[PDB]
Ligand SMILES: C=CC1=C(C)/C(=C/c2[nH]c(/C=C3N=C(/C=C4\NC(=O)C(C)=C4C=C)C(C)=C\3CCC(=O)O)c(CCC(=O)O)c2C)NC1=O
Ligand SMILES: *[C@@H]1O[C@H](CO)[C@@H](O[C@@H]2O[C@H](CO)[C@@H](O)[C@H](O)[C@H]2NC(C)=O)[C@H](O)[C@H]1NC(C)=O
Ligand SMILES: CCCCC/C=C\C/C=C\CCCCCCCC(=O)O
Ligand SMILES: *[C@@H]1O[C@H](CO)[C@@H](O)[C@H](O)[C@H]1NC(C)=O
Ligand SMILES: *[C@@H]1O[C@H](CO)[C@@H](O)[C@H](O)[C@H]1NC(C)=O
Ligand SMILES: *[C@@H]1O[C@H](CO)[C@@H](O)[C@H](O)[C@H]1NC(C)=O
Ligand SMILES: *[C@@H]1O[C@H](CO)[C@@H](O)[C@H](O)[C@H]1NC(C)=O
Ligand SMILES: *[C@@H]1O[C@H](CO)[C@@H](O)[C@H](O)[C@H]1NC(C)=O
Ligand SMILES: *[C@@H]1O[C@H](CO)[C@@H](O)[C@H](O)[C@H]1NC(C)=O
Ligand SMILES: *[C@@H]1O[C@H](CO)[C@@H](O)[C@H](O)[C@H]1NC(C)=O
Ligand SMILES: *[C@@H]1O[C@H](CO)[C@@H](O)[C@H](O)[C@H]1NC(C)=O
Ligand SMILES: *[C@@H]1O[C@H](CO)[C@@H](O)[C@H](O)[C@H]1NC(C)=O
C-alpha cells in the first residue's frame with residue numbers, strides 16, 4: 001500500500017472492530033469455541049457495510 | 050433411647066468473616082463467557098458467620114439449635130468426618146413434621162417425619178473389640194418416628210471414619226433454602242490443607258437436590274459424631290472425646306449479584322452488588338472493572 | 341437506479357427431526373387416577389413421576405374429568421413436550437371447593453389445607469367420586485383442617501392435630517370453650533347435593549424446557565442429522581438451525597446452553613449423551629444492483645461475505661466476479 | 677364499622693361460586709373497604725353465570 | 727442491540743421457540759406481538775442514536 | 777418527566793403501591809411490567825430530547 005510512514009503509524013494506532021468485511025458462514029460456524037461479537041451481530045441481522 | 054451430655058465447656062459464639070463465599074449456580078442452564086446479574090437469596094460478602102469447633106484440647110462439642118432465617122450457608126472443615134448430618138424443623142418435639150438428613154456410615158438417609166428428637170442428638174463412634182478398627186456403634190438421634198411422609202435412602206457404601214491427626218483435609222460447603230415447599234440443597238466439596246478459619250477463594254456451589262418435603266422450617270442443628278474408645282475413662286455421658294472438626298453457619302439474605310461465567314461454563318468470580326460503592330458502580334455498569 | 345439492501349440470505353429447513361429420551365414405560369395413570377384410597381386434603385399425597393411416557397389417551401376410555409385446567413402450557417401442546425420433574429398431588433375435597441384449587445385463591449382449602457403458587461406450571465384435574473368415596477351413613481374418613489393460625493405457604497403440608505386456641509385462655513392440650521380440634525371430617529353420602537359430594541383432585545406440577553427430563557409425550561423419535569438446516573425438536577424445544585459437534589462439557593444437571601441474547605445455542609442430545617451446537621442457517625447480507633425499472637428489468641446481486649474465487653447464493657447464473665465487497669453475480673467485469 | 681374477618685364462614689358456609697373483580701382474593705385480608713354494600717337475591721343455578 | 731434480545735418485554739419468555747413450544751398459536755400470538763413491539767422499540771432507539 | 781409518572785400506560789393504576797396492595801405477585805407482575813415499560817420509554821424520550 002502507498003501509505004506514508006505517518007499514515008502507517010496512525011493506522012496501527014487505532015484498532016478497527018471489523019478487521020475486514022468478508023466473514024463467511026463457514027467461519028462463524030467453525031469458531032464455536034471462540035465467541036466473536038461480529039458473528040452474533042451478523043446472525044441477528046446487524047451487518048456493517 | 051438417649052442420654053444427655055454433661056462434660057460441657059461453652060464459650061460465647063465466635064464470629065468470622067465470609068471472604069466472598071457462598072455462591073451457587075442460580076439455574077440449570079449452561080452459560081459461558083458472560084456476565085449475568087441475578088437477584089436471589091445469597092450470603093452477603095464479608096458477612097459475620099458464626100463458628101463452632103469441636104475439640105478436646107477444653108472438651109467442647111457445641112451444637113445449638115440455631116435459627117433458619119429463610120436460608121442457611123453451612124460450611125464444615127474437617128478431616129475425620131465428624132459432621133455427619135443435620136436436623137431441620139420448627140419445634141423438633143414431635144408436635145410437627147421435621148426433616149432429618151443423616152450419614153450413618155453406610156447410607157445417606159433423608160426422612161421427613163414426626164420425630165421426637167433428643168435434647169443433644171449424636172452419632173457415637175466406638176473402637177470395636179470384634180476388630181481393632183473405628184466404626185459406628187451408637188445412633189442416638191430420636192426416640193420415636195410416626196406419620197412418616199418421605200424416604201430417600203441411598204445405596205450402601207463405606208467411608209474411612211478413623212480419627213486422623215493433622216490439618217483439615219476437606220471443606221464441604223452447603224446452601225440450604227426452603228422455597229415454595231421445596232428444600233433446595235446446593236453442595237461443593239473442595240480439598241484444603243488448613244487449620245484456621247474459612248479459606249480465601251471462590252467456589253460455585255452446584256445444585257445437589259430439590260427435595261419435596263413441604264414443611265415449615267425455622268430452626269436446625271447439626272448431628273456430630275462422638276469419638277469413643279478404651280483410652281478414656283467415664284460412663285456414656287462422660288466417657289467420650291470429641292473429634293477435631295469445625296463448621297461455620299451464615300444466613301442468606303435477598304441480594305443482587307453479578308456473576309462471571311468463564312469459557313468452560315464455571316462461575317469463576319462474582320460481585321456483591323450493594324456491598325460498597327465500588328461494587329455498586331460495578332453493579333451499575335455491568336462490569337468487573339471500572340476506568 | 342441504485343443498489344438496495346434486501347433480506348439476508350435465507351436457507352429453508354430441509355427436514356424435521358425429533359429427539360426424545362429413550363423410554364417406553366407408560367406413566368402410572370392407573371396408580372394415580374385409579375387408586376382405591378385417595379388421601380385427605382389436609383394430608384395430601386405427593387407422588388413422583390419419572391422415566392415414562394405421558395400418552396394420556398388411555399384415560400379417554402374410562403375416566404371423564406369434571407375440570408381440567410392447565411397453567412403455563414396449552415392443553416394442545418402436551419403431546420409435543422417433555423417434563424423435567426413431575427409431581428402428582430392427590431387428595432379428595434368437597435364439590436364446591438374444586439374452584440379453590442387454583443393459583444391465587446382464598447378459602448378454607450386454599451388457606452389451611454392446600455395452597456398453590458402463581459408461579460405455577462401444571463394442570464389441575466378434578467372428577468366426581470360420589471360412587472366411590474360416598475357411602476350410606478356418611479364416609480367420615482376424609483378430613484380437612486378447619487382452623488389454623490396463619491395461611492399455609494404454597495405446597496406446604498401441615499398434619500398436626502394440636503388443639504386450636506381461638507380465645508385468650510390457653511387450651512393446655514385439651515378441648516373446651518374456644519378450644520376446637522383443628523381437623524373436621526367431611527360427611528359424604530350418596531343421596532346428597534352435588535356441590536357437597538366428594539371430588540377426587542390430582543394436581544400435576546412440572547417445569548418445561550429448562551432442565552433434563554424423563555417424562556415425555558408420545559412423540560416418536562427420529563434419526564439425528566448434522567450439518568443441515570433442519571426443524572429439530574429436542575425435548576420439546578422446537579426451533580430451526582444447523583446442528584454440529586460441540587467441545588462444550590455440560591454438567592450432569594444441564595440440558596441446554598444459552599447466549600447473551602438468551603437464545604439456545606447448545607443442547608445435550610437425549611438419546612446419545614453428546615452436546616450439539618445449534619447455529620442459525622440464515623446468514624449474510626444481500627444487495628440488488630438495478631438500473632431504473634423503465635430502463636431494464638435486469639439486476640445484479642451482491643452477496644456480501646461469500647467467496648466466489650454449493651455456494652450460499654440464490655442462483656449462480658453466469659458472470660460471477662469476486663469483489664472486495666462480496667460476490668457479484670450478473671455483472672460483467674471490465675478492466676477500464 | 678366492620679371487621680371483615682370472614683373466617684367464621686368456613687365453619688358452615690359452602691359457596692358454589694365466589695369470583696372477585698378488581699381485587700385479588702388473597703389480598704382481601706390486607707385491605708380496608710370504604711363504601712361497602714351487599715346486594716342480596718335468589719335466582720336459579722343456570723343464571724348464576726349472568 | 728444484540729444484548730437487548732434477552733428481555734421479556736412483558737412476554738412469558740424472551741425466546742420465540744419457548745413460546746411456540748409451550749403455547750399453540752392460540753395464545754402464542756399475543757406474546758409474540760409483545761416481543762415484536764419491544765424489539766421494534768429497541769431497533770428504533772438504536773436508529774435514533776445512530 | 778415527573779408529570780409523566782401520572783400515566784397508567786395500560787396498567788390498572790399509575791401507583792405501584794396501589795397495584796401491589798390490590799393485586800398480589802400473582803397478577804401484579806404484568807401490571808408492574810407495563811408500568812416499567814412505559815416509564816422506560818418516557819426516560820428514553822427524555823434522553824433523546826436531551
Ligand atoms: C450429609 C449428607 C450427605 C450429602 C449431602 C452427600 C453428598 C455427596 N457425597 C459425596 C461423596 C463423598 N461423601 C463423603 C463424606 C461426607 N459428605 C458430606 O456431605 C458429609 C457431611 C460427609 C461426612 C460424613 C466423602 C469423603 C466423599 C468422597 C469420597 C472420598 O474422597 O473419601 C458426593 C459425590 C458423589 C458420590 O458420592 O459419588 C456427594 C454428592 N453425602 C452425605 O452423606
Ligand atoms: C412456621 O413456624 C413458625 C413457628 O412455629 C410460625 O411462626 C409463629 O407464628 C405464630 C402465629 O401466631 C406466632 O405466635 C409465633 O410467634 C411465630 N413464631 C416464630 C418463630 O415466628 C410460622 O407461622 C409458621 N409458618 C406458617 C406458614 O405456618
Ligand atoms: C358482611 C359482609 C362484609 C363484606 C366486607 C367486604 C369484603 C370482605 C372480603 C370478602 C367477603 C367474602 C368472603 C367469602 C369467604 C371465602 C369463600 C371461599 O373462597 O371459601
Ligand atoms: C436430660 O435427658 C432427659 C431425657 O433423656 C431430658 O428430658 C432432659 O431435658 C435432659 N436434661 C436437660 C437439661 O435438658
Ligand atoms: C459483624 O461484622 C462487622 C464487620 O466485619 C464487625 O465489625 C462486627 O464486630 C461483627 N459483629 C460481631 C458481633 O462480631
Ligand atoms: C444405618 O446403617 C445401617 C447399616 O450399617 C443401614 O442398614 C441403615 O439403613 C442405616 N440407617 C437408616 C435409617 O437407614
Ligand atoms: C399421626 O399419628 C397419630 C398417632 O400415631 C395418628 O393418630 C394419626 O392418625 C396420624 N395422622 C396422619 C396424617 O398420619
Ligand atoms: C477449559 O477446558 C479445556 C478442556 O476442555 C482445558 O484445556 C482448559 O484448560 C480449561 N480452561 C479453564 C480456565 O478451565
Ligand atoms: C381404571 O379402572 C377401571 C375400572 O376397573 C378400568 O376399566 C380402567 O381400565 C382403568 N384405567 C387404567 C388406565 O388403568
Ligand atoms: C434407544 O432404544 C433402542 C431400543 O431400546 C436401542 O436400540 C438403542 O440402542 C437405544 N439408544 C441409546 C443411546 O440408548
Ligand atoms: C423511464 O424511461 C422513460 C423512457 O422510455 C422515460 O420517459 C421516463 O422519464 C423514465 N422515468 C424515470 C423515473 O427515470
Ligand atoms: C476469500 O476472500 C478473500 C478476500 O476477497 C480472498 O483474499 C481469498 O483469496 C478468498 N479465498 C480463496 C481460497 O481464494
Ligand SMILES: *[C@@H]1O[C@H](CO)[C@@H](O)[C@H](O)[C@H]1NC(C)=O
Pocket residue numbers: 675
Ligand atoms: C483484464 O486484465 C487482466 C489482468 O490484468 C487480464 O488477465 C485480462 O485478460 C484483461 N481482460 C480484458 C478484457 O482486457
